[PDB]
Amino acid sequence: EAVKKWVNKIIEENIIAVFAKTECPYCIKAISILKGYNLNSHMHVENIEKNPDMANIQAYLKELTGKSSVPRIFINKDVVGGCDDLVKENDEGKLKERLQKLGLVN
């Protein structure tokens, strides 16, 4: 239960929640895209590889999203998914619409 509660608190306390790991190019790219929207104040990045419970965290992220890979991206508890999902939403205008509805971008 403790792992699930830990992941949940990260997702609930931060509007933009990103689970990543060390030296992960698509993590870095996703985080960079999000920071380009000046989301820093409402973003939290958790490195789940530097964690004794990495497998449990990944299994729970898969239960929540369908995939165990990082990056895993949540916006106001909604599953965005991975960096490719973020790029699709960004290119098609859905990311900006998300952030507008949250008051995060004018």
Among 4, 29, 42, 44, binds Pt ion (CB under 5 A): 44
Establish whether 92 is an annotated binding residue.
Answer: no
Could you tell me the smallest distance in angstroms from the CB atom of residue 51 to Pt ion?
9
Could you tell me the smallest distance in angstroms from the CB atom of residue 2 to Pt ion?
18
Among 54, 79, 102, 105, binds Pt ion (CB under 5 A): 54
From residue 77, give the alpha-carbon distance in Å to each of 22, 24, 38, 52: 23, 23, 19, 24
Establish whether 56 is an annotated binding residue.
Answer: no
Establish whether 49 is an annotated binding residue.
Answer: yes
Q: Would you say 44 or 96 has its CB closer to Pt ion?
A: 44
Could you tell me the smallest distance in angstroms from the CB atom of residue 88 to Pt ion?
25
* 3-class state of residue 43 by DSSP: strand
- Angstrom distance (rounded) from CA 42 to CA 75: 10
Give the footprint of Pt ion on this chain (CB under 5 A).
44, 54
Binding residues, as ranges, are 23, 38, 44, 46, 49
